[PDB]
Structure 1
Amino acid sequence: HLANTSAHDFSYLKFVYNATDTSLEGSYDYIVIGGGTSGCPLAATLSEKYKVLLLERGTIATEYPNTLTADGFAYNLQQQDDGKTPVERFVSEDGIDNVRARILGGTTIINAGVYARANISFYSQTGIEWDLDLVNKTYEWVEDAIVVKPNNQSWQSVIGEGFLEAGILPDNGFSLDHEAGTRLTGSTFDNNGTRHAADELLNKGDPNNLLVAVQASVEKILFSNLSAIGVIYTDSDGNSHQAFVRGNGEVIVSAGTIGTPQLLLLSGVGPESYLSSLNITVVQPNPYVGQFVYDNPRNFINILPPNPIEASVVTVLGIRSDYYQVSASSLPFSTPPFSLFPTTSYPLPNSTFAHIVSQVPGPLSHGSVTLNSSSDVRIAPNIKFNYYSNSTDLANCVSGMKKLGDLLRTKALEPYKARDVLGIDGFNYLGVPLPQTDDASFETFCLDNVASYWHYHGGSLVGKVLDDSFRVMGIKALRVVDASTFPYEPNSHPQGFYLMLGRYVGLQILQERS
């Protein structure tokens, strides 16, 4: 039911082409925009029966070898964004540094590798009529390709012992399920540290039916009884290209929380007063495109143990309904990995350190995506998350930070203290330590020291922009499948859900059509 350790499988490169190739232009059964977490498994699934074009703005992961190992994770965030790199840097209007992927495989090529299935209650909360047996079969299809049971890592075992001592019960052992308590979960990093990612799911596609264009920047959805008929995309030289769908085929947007609402607005799908104010012709009025955009808060402390600890990838989770906690151990660095700390002016560690983290669930706070340019998709849109605008989110951070307090007080973490004193002032901290234990100091700490968890979602919600089949309401032959679709996180680590969702919706399209 799980993958083995093995090299990153690039066999699919036999059907990957440069978008400069004009022989890609023409008619397909399906066009999928964004070769990411959802887009890759979706395109692979549709290609079992139909001719599919997958368009990805980034290049291939072979160009950036530091994307293919666990110990390259920080390198990709440290690297300057020259417009070509797998990591695109942005800053939310809240002032918090963030990143998104620009690469075939999408955010699975740059992420922290943690694999989990959705909270099994999530499906019924959505009110979508899911095929739940098919959901589970689709999880196994992903897991069998790219997920391993992780090997023991000393720092992760310390943290898991600490979560258990701090009252994060029960002990769930090794499990992929989002459940209360402490567990070892799966990883898309194998036991040799090789990264596995959504691009490898292209290997499950039919190589006679699937074509992938890289460095393909999709600029516009073309429309006809309003129907999507195609896309315009530009290549890395700046020349324009067109592709179309035929007969009962469909265009699917899988361009992510940021890319999907951006392309919909650029194509005239969006709020009538907003688009009219930019002189963008309205093709389909919908007041919710780019609305309900969410970023779960990351709050953290950093400890500097007096003896070196061994670097680890996150595999051990401490889950409560109101906070989701993990820790990674890291080598020091002299270039900050962009967005690990919320600004570039954060003190850098001189020794090995443990990043100890809590994630707010939901979140309930939301903002929006708006266009920066009314014409050029390569210009990043504006994004604002309104961190802690909702007081329930602030209340949940307070609970998380008190639990990190309990964690630092465990026998498990005592050996990582610099001074054998009774209190948590015995640790050496990088940045702001935890507080005083009245609510007000914990609130200040939460508000002042917030970072992105990187699990941002929304902007094209089911119930707002889409129906229960992921169709853009009012438009034939157009769907959206990616993290733009749900307002609340399906779990602590949603890559597993969006990998599954790509294939699941592909199977629903194939069934609808049969």
Structure 2
Amino acid sequence: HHHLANTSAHDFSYLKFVYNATDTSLEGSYDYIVIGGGTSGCPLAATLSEKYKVLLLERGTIATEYPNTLTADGFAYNLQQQDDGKTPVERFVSEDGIDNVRARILGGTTIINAGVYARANISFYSQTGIEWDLDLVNKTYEWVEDAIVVKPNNQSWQSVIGEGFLEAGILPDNGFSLDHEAGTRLTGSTFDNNGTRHAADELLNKGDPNNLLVAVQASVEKILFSSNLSAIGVIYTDSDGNSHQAFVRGNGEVIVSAGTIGTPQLLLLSGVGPESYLSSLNITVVQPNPYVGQFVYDNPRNFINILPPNPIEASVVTVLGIRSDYYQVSASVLPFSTPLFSLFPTTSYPLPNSTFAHIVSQVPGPLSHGSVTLNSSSDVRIAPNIKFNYYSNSTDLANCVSGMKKLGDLLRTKALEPYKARDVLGIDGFNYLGVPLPQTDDASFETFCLDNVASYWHYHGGSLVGKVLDDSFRVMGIKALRVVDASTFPYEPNSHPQGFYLMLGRYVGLQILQERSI
């Protein structure tokens, strides 16, 4: 933990090589084009720029345009803000009926998220069967952590929840650790101890400022292709609606880093995907693959809200209670009269009048899956349809039951006892915002899980390694095309995956360079 970042202002030095996509002089040949300046995309583009000419295209603007993205205090504002098509938070509703968000900004979802930093479960690497260079993975985590991760200072509510998890049997006590392991710990945060947000856009500062160019408000609409099928470039439009082209040259590559939703969407619009589906939309099939936009996952969030009779201090999540079958945390949150879109799964949810503890459990995997399909067959700015099929797999429901029973145990701890409105024996002594925990039968817990599910926001899949990609993240059947982002895996790396996806952008960047050099 020598390596971690210090308290520091958000480093915008990289803006010296950020340009409006309206600039036609960005058009031309590069060694690499990275689509999506997000969690994976920014460290990938920065890494490739050490040796080669890179163009990073991001649909959103720069985070300075939306100052409430730059502090812990600002987190609520960004989810409360109406989506006018330019804001850093893009709102959507799954076909399941569950409200959700994705980022639209340079730095991607690291500019809007809850700041929690963790490394992958060390068993994840062997689970994938990918031949990881595990020494390099660990060097890559330290490169991220040196730049943007701190050891969080103590927060009253997080310490209460930590004592509660330990008392409720989420053992052992792991103290301060970045590692995803069974038990209770303080993990890292991308919010510094002054409340400054640090994010994936800062990793652009590790890029070579003579090799890296970033275009913002660059909406990438199509991947361009070469009978030896290759990606050759992209079409992108600017904020005025004019079209632009860029190309890769020589042994260069296009990498799609547009997220679980953006990646499959762009692959389908470009004619990569299921043959009968694309041919049903009269989209010319460049590469038939049945799995583009298939195996899309959203880990369920289930929760209760308690309203302590004395105010609690608002906190960012730093304390985690991990078991193999559920991952638990709690935020303490100020009251509001404008809802945080997707905090609760629909717009019809009570507003809190006082400070509340949002106490949550995450279902691992999950095993339930759905898909991304096109709404428009031409317009990338029209959000695709996304369905997660929450609790379609009975294992997921069984795991939520275990998690909700454990939150029951948590509300019974001496740790939490001071936060009750009534000094009675039962957890009905708490005041609840919304639905409280339900008897000695699983069926009431099942109904609670099914009825009150929300998004954890850690959705993943749609371009899986083993289905769309090979073990080098290449799109099977296409040269000079890769995918690096959360679309690539069908299970979580851990409870809080930003750490893994930040590492993955640089790691795959280093594998591309090593491949090159031979």
Range of TM-score over shorter length: over 0.9
Query: How many angstroms apart in 2 are the aligned matches of 1:452 and 1:71?
Result: 22
Shift of 1:108: 0.1
Query: How many angstroms apart in 2 are the aligned matches of 1:54 and 1:297?
Result: 32
Query: How many angstroms apart in 2 are the aligned matches of 1:271 and 1:437?
Result: 47
Query: How many angstroms apart in 1 are the aligned matches of 2:440 and 2:302?
Result: 17
**Structure 2 match to 1:58:** 60
Query: How many angstroms apart in 1 are the aligned matches of 2:145 and 2:500?
Result: 11
Structure 1 unpaired stretches of 5+: none
**Structure 1 match to 2:407:** 404
**Structure 2 match to 1:425:** 428
Query: How many angstroms apart in 2 are the aligned matches of 1:229 and 1:266?
Result: 16
Shift of 1:452: 0.1
Shift of 1:437: 3.2
Query: How many angstroms apart in 2 are the aligned matches of 1:210 and 1:70?
Result: 29
DSSP 3-state at the match of 1:70: coil
Query: How many angstroms apart in 2 are the aligned matches of 1:76 and 1:39?
Result: 22
DSSP 3-state at the match of 2:114: coil
Query: How many angstroms apart in 1 are the aligned matches of 2:457 and 2:190?
Result: 17
DSSP 3-state at the match of 1:71: coil
DSSP 3-state at the match of 1:342: coil
Query: How many angstroms apart in 2 are the aligned matches of 1:437 and 1:187?
Result: 38
Runs of 4 or more consecutive aligned structure 1 residues displaced over 2 Å after TM superposition: none
DSSP 3-state at the match of 1:250: strand
Shift of 1:255: 0.1
Higher alpha-carbon deviation: 489-498 or 218-227: 218-227
Structure 2 unpaired stretches of 5+: none
Query: How many angstroms apart in 1 are the aligned matches of 2:247 and 2:462?
Result: 25
Shift of 1:451: 0.2
DSSP 3-state at the match of 1:247: strand
**Structure 2 match to 1:300:** 303
Shift of 1:263: 0.1
Structure 1 residue corresponding to 2:333, chosen from 324, 330, 341: 330
**Structure 1 match to 2:272:** 269
Query: How many angstroms apart in 1 are the aligned matches of 2:18 and 2:371?
Result: 34
Query: How many angstroms apart in 2 are the aligned matches of 1:511 and 1:52?
Result: 17
Residue-by-residue CA offset, 1:56-89 (whole Å, 9 max, x unaligned): 0000000000000001001000000000000000
**Structure 2 match to 1:216:** 218
Query: How many angstroms apart in 2 are the aligned matches of 1:353 and 1:183?
Result: 22
**Structure 2 match to 1:144:** 146
DSSP 3-state at the match of 1:151: coil
DSSP 3-state at the match of 1:484: helix
Query: How many angstroms apart in 2 are the aligned matches of 1:397 and 1:482?
Result: 27
DSSP 3-state at the match of 1:41: helix
Shift of 1:334: 0.2
**Structure 2 match to 1:468:** 471
Shift of 1:339: 0.1
Query: How many angstroms apart in 2 are the aligned matches of 1:181 and 1:287?
Result: 40
DSSP 3-state at the match of 1:378: coil
**Structure 2 match to 1:506:** 509
TM-score, normalised via structure 2 length: 0.99
Shift of 1:185: 0.1
Shift of 1:436: 1.5
Task: Spell out the pairing of 1:302-317 with structure 2 (5 A cutoff).
Answer: 302-317=305-320
Query: How many angstroms apart in 2 are the aligned matches of 1:437 and 1:67?
Result: 44
Task: Spell out the pairing of 1:368-387 with structure 2 (5 A cutoff).
Answer: 368-387=371-390
Query: How many angstroms apart in 2 are the aligned matches of 1:161 and 1:154?
Result: 11
Size of the alignment, in residue pairs?
A: 514
Structure 2 residue corresponding to 1:167, chosen from 156, 166, 169: 169
Query: How many angstroms apart in 2 are the aligned matches of 1:149 and 1:142?
Result: 14
Residue-by-residue CA offset, 1:28-83 (whole Å, 9 max, x unaligned): 00000000000000000000000000000000000000000001001000000000
Q: Do structure 1's residue 342 and structure 2's residue 352 form an aligned pair?
A: no
Query: How many angstroms apart in 2 are the aligned matches of 1:95 and 1:48?
Result: 44
Shift of 1:27: 0.0
Structure 2 residue corresponding to 1:133, chosen from 132, 135, 141: 135
Query: How many angstroms apart in 2 are the aligned matches of 1:267 and 1:6?
Result: 42
Q: Do structure 1's residue 249 and structure 2's residue 252 form an aligned pair?
A: yes
Query: How many angstroms apart in 1 are the aligned matches of 2:498 and 2:179?
Result: 13
Residue-by-residue CA offset, 1:458-504 (whole Å, 9 max, x unaligned): 00000000000000000000000000000000000000000000000
Query: How many angstroms apart in 2 are the aligned matches of 1:12 and 1:362?
Result: 36
Residue-by-residue CA offset, 1:93-152 (whole Å, 9 max, x unaligned): 000000000000000000000000000000000000000000000000000000000000
Residue-by-residue CA offset, 1:282-334 (whole Å, 9 max, x unaligned): 00000000000000000000000000000000000000000000000010000
Query: How many angstroms apart in 2 are the aligned matches of 1:282 and 1:306?
Result: 61
Structure 1 residue corresponding to 2:243, chosen from 236, 240, 244: 240
Structure 1 residue corresponding to 2:294, chosen from 291, 295, 319: 291
Query: How many angstroms apart in 2 are the aligned matches of 1:36 and 1:437?
Result: 46
DSSP 3-state at the match of 1:93: coil
Query: How many angstroms apart in 2 are the aligned matches of 1:104 and 1:3?
Result: 21
**Structure 1 match to 2:190:** 188
Query: How many angstroms apart in 2 are the aligned matches of 1:227 and 1:353?
Result: 53
Shift of 1:354: 0.2
Query: How many angstroms apart in 1 are the aligned matches of 2:73 and 2:346?
Result: 23
Q: How much identity, in percent, do the aligned residues show? A: 100
Query: How many angstroms apart in 2 are the aligned matches of 1:482 and 1:307?
Result: 43
Query: How many angstroms apart in 2 are the aligned matches of 1:309 and 1:374?
Result: 49
CA RMSD of aligned residues (A): 0.4
Query: How many angstroms apart in 2 are the aligned matches of 1:23 and 1:495?
Result: 33
Query: How many angstroms apart in 1 are the aligned matches of 2:169 and 2:180?
Result: 17
Query: How many angstroms apart in 2 are the aligned matches of 1:64 and 1:145?
Result: 22
Residue-by-residue CA offset, 1:350-375 (whole Å, 9 max, x unaligned): 00000000000000000000000000
